[PDB]
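Q: I'm a student working through a structural biology exercise. My instructor gave each of us a protein and asked us to get a predicted structure, then write a short paragraph describing it. Mine is Amyloid beta A4 precursor protein-binding family B member 1-interacting protein. I'm not confident about reading structure output yet, so if you can add a plain explanation after the tokens, that would really help. Here is the sequence I was given:
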Amino acid sequence: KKLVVKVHMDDSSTKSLMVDERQLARDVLDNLFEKTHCDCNVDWCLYEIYPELQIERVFEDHENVVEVLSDWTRDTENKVLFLEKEERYAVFKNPQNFYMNAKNKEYLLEESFCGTSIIVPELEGALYLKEDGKKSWKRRYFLLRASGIYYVPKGKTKTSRDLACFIQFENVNIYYGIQCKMKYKAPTDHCFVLKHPQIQKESQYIKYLCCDDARTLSQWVMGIRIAKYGKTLYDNYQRAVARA
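A: Happy to help. First, here is the predicted structure for Amyloid beta A4 precursor protein-binding family B member 1-interacting protein. I'll explain a few features afterward.
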């Protein structure tokens, strides 16, 4: 299987590439680096836009391009952009901002990514969860874990015995939600979205989460990406640095 992928540039030009089943985002980026003669910095990425849903996310570099794009409908408005998103590897540049001199940064990342298991940032706090099909939001206290977003049930304790799972990351991508304040009466526009890659239109299965703060959004998007992708994210970063 092969797809023609139209990659949309910052200057509104487009580059069409023949992409076979074996190509990762990493390979498409390498191709674009050669064609564009860009500085090859670590922030350059493929970036998926859903115009209809008004959601968007970075492709991770290890992701299979055909697999991602095969979820798109026949009449899709979805686009792939080539752009700089300095948020994508923020944790690797500045681990102190999620978990400083170079030596202490290196020690922190070694501790967090190079052990037997990944150490996810100790992230917890209240977010607003959108009610399914309604312009209505509910404040809920959430806890980040490697496997998913967890919560304490009413009358229970904050322990591994009692923690209940809201959502697992395994079958869900994380996206930025755009204009959720206007569309759905979100308290703010600092929103992220969890949905199965296969969902391409309006659906109750899409989960909308609003943060009070721009900082809170940044913490949660980075944190969930660390949790979902784990060591692969670190490997992705190492591969990117070698090209810069």
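A: Here are two points you could use in your paragraph. The radius of gyration is 19 Å. The helical segments are 25-36, 65-69, 90-93, 102-113, 180-184, 214-229, 231-241. It's a good idea to check both against the output above yourself.
Q: Great, thank you!
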